[PDB]
Enzyme design. Structure first.
Site, PDB file in Angstrom:
ATOM      1  N   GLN A  18      -2.595   4.837  10.446  1.00  0.00           N
ATOM      2  CA  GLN A  18      -2.209   3.812   9.502  1.00  0.00           C
ATOM      3  C   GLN A  18      -1.755   4.506   7.844  1.00  0.00           C
ATOM      4  OE1 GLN A  18      -5.459   1.064  11.311  1.00  0.00           O
ATOM      5  NE2 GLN A  18      -5.027   0.932   9.019  1.00  0.00           N
ATOM      6  N   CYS A  24      -2.950  -2.085  10.824  1.00  0.00           N
ATOM      7  CA  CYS A  24      -3.719  -1.940  12.247  1.00  0.00           C
ATOM      8  C   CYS A  24      -2.839  -3.060  13.078  1.00  0.00           C
ATOM      9  CB  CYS A  24      -5.094  -2.505  12.048  1.00  0.00           C
ATOM     10  SG  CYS A  24      -5.293  -3.806  11.462  1.00  0.00           S
ATOM     11  N   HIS A 161     -10.034  -6.409  12.403  1.00  0.00           N
ATOM     12  CA  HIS A 161      -9.266  -5.256  12.692  1.00  0.00           C
ATOM     13  C   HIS A 161      -8.373  -5.340  14.175  1.00  0.00           C
ATOM     14  CE1 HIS A 161      -7.817  -1.079  12.552  1.00  0.00           C
ATOM     15  NE2 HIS A 161      -8.551  -0.796  13.491  1.00  0.00           N
ATOM     16  N   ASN A 181      -6.974   3.132  18.832  1.00  0.00           N
ATOM     17  CA  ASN A 181      -7.034   2.684  17.444  1.00  0.00           C
ATOM     18  C   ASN A 181      -5.775   3.523  16.958  1.00  0.00           C
ATOM     19  OD1 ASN A 181      -7.834   1.656  15.205  1.00  0.00           O
ATOM     20  ND2 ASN A 181     -10.055   2.258  15.292  1.00  0.00           N
TER      21      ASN A 181
HETATM   22  C1  LIG Z   1      -6.356  -3.705   9.766  1.00  0.00           C
HETATM   23  O1  LIG Z   1      -6.250  -2.331   9.267  1.00  0.00           O
HETATM   24  C2  LIG Z   1      -6.272  -4.830   8.777  1.00  0.00           C
HETATM   25  C3  LIG Z   1      -7.172  -4.278   7.652  1.00  0.00           C
HETATM   26  C4  LIG Z   1      -6.844  -5.217   6.616  1.00  0.00           C
HETATM   27  C5  LIG Z   1      -7.787  -5.057   5.171  1.00  0.00           C
HETATM   28  C6  LIG Z   1      -7.325  -3.728   4.365  1.00  0.00           C
HETATM   29  N1  LIG Z   1      -6.786  -5.921   9.394  1.00  0.00           N
HETATM   30  C7  LIG Z   1      -5.780  -6.853   9.636  1.00  0.00           C
HETATM   31  O2  LIG Z   1      -4.685  -6.905   9.500  1.00  0.00           O
HETATM   32  C8  LIG Z   1      -6.300  -8.126  10.408  1.00  0.00           C
HETATM   33  C9  LIG Z   1      -5.860  -8.320  11.961  1.00  0.00           C
HETATM   34  C10 LIG Z   1      -6.973  -8.815  12.793  1.00  0.00           C
HETATM   35  C11 LIG Z   1      -7.867  -9.745  12.101  1.00  0.00           C
HETATM   36  C12 LIG Z   1      -6.027  -9.436  13.866  1.00  0.00           C
HETATM   37  N2  LIG Z   1      -5.551  -9.459   9.656  1.00  0.00           N
HETATM   38  C13 LIG Z   1      -5.918  -9.982   8.239  1.00  0.00           C
HETATM   39  O3  LIG Z   1      -6.810  -9.001   7.727  1.00  0.00           O
HETATM   40  O4  LIG Z   1      -5.617 -10.994   7.943  1.00  0.00           O
HETATM   41  C14 LIG Z   1      -5.677 -10.845   6.520  1.00  0.00           C
HETATM   42  C15 LIG Z   1      -4.215 -11.668   6.112  1.00  0.00           C
HETATM   43  C16 LIG Z   1      -3.998 -11.720   4.715  1.00  0.00           C
HETATM   44  C17 LIG Z   1      -2.939 -12.388   4.315  1.00  0.00           C
HETATM   45  C18 LIG Z   1      -2.123 -12.988   5.275  1.00  0.00           C
HETATM   46 BR1  LIG Z   1      -0.380 -13.893   4.536  1.00  0.00          BR
HETATM   47  C19 LIG Z   1      -2.242 -12.866   6.538  1.00  0.00           C
HETATM   48  C20 LIG Z   1      -3.267 -12.027   6.991  1.00  0.00           C
END
Ligand SMILES: *C(=O)[C@H](CCCC)NC(=O)[C@H](CC(C)C)NC(=O)OCc1ccc(Br)cc1
Length: 214
Positions: A18, A24, A161, A181
């Site tokens: 990433q 992710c 994640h 991952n």
């Molecule tokens: C994985 O690298 C990321 C880390 C984000 C923090 C830096 N995690 C995600 O992308 C999660 C995915 C799982 C929960 C399925 N999604 C997420 O963090 O949602 C946050 C979000 C913020 C704003 C909007 Br618009 C959509 C989603």
């Protein structure tokens, strides 16, 4: 099926990294799509994580996102580019259009019955690699090196994640989920981690799983 490992059939592309971006979910989404593509055409190739980071507006690029929305995007956009035609840069940029970039298509997606590991298993065996969400905030997970990962303090209700289930099986009497991952091939076990299967839905592995239709 008793045990599945899509890596053995060549349905899985190499482990990505990433970089300085919380993409992710884009990685998770492409991994699933790359699976349905191999199954459908016989071709194994990298799809564009960047195409999703830049275009899935329902999401938030490097700030995070959801796999379903990515699948909805690829379907609505009538396609996703390949890594080669739309290379990964590790940051959100303007949505680019590559006239020759299309490398796969998506006709929708399905979700796995929330918290159902048995249903997740059936879906992996019959569909191929499945995108799943988990809680990866525990130092135990972040520093995983070997064995079947299980930490009782994992929070099933703290999905943060996105990863990829390329299979499942058992190791030393411990049933697991084969997880890819995207923190590079140096994280975990060559970019992989075996997570507890049938241990009360450890880390919420089956709380937000989905796969693309192709
Ligand atoms: C994985 O690298 C990321 C880390 C984000 C923090 C830096 N995690 C995600 O992308 C999660 C995915 C799982 C929960 C399925 N999604 C997420 O963090 O949602 C946050 C979000 C913020 C704003 C909007 Br618009 C959509 C989603």
């Amino acid at each position: 099926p008793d045990s599945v490992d899509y890596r053995k059939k060549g349905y899985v592309t190499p482990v990505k990294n990433q970089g300085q971006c919380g993409s992710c979910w884009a990685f998770s989404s492409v991994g699933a799509l790359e699976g349905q593509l191999k199954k459908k055409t016989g071709k194994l190739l990298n799809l564009s994580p960047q195409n999703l980071v830049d275009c899935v507006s329902e999401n938030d690029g490097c700030g995070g996102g959801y796999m379903t929305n990515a699948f909805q995007y690829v379907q609505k956009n009538r396609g996703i580019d390949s890594e080669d035609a739309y290379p990964y840069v590790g940051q959100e940029e303007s949505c680019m259009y590559n006239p020759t970039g299309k490398a796969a298509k998506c006709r929708g997606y399905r979700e796995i019955p929330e918290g159902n590991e048995k249903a997740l298993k059936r879906a992996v065996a019959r569909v191929g690699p499945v995108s799943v969400a988990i809680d990866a905030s525990l130092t135990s997970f972040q520093f995983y090196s070997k064995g079947v990962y299980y930490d009782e303090s994992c929070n099933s209700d703290n999905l943060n994640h996105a990863v990829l289930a390329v299979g499942y099986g058992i190791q030393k009497g411990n049933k697991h989920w084969i997880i890819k991952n995207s923190w590079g091939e140096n994280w975990g076990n060559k970019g992989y981690i075996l997570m507890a299967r049938n241990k009360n839905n450890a880390c919420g592995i089956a709380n937000l799983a989905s796969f693309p239709k192709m």
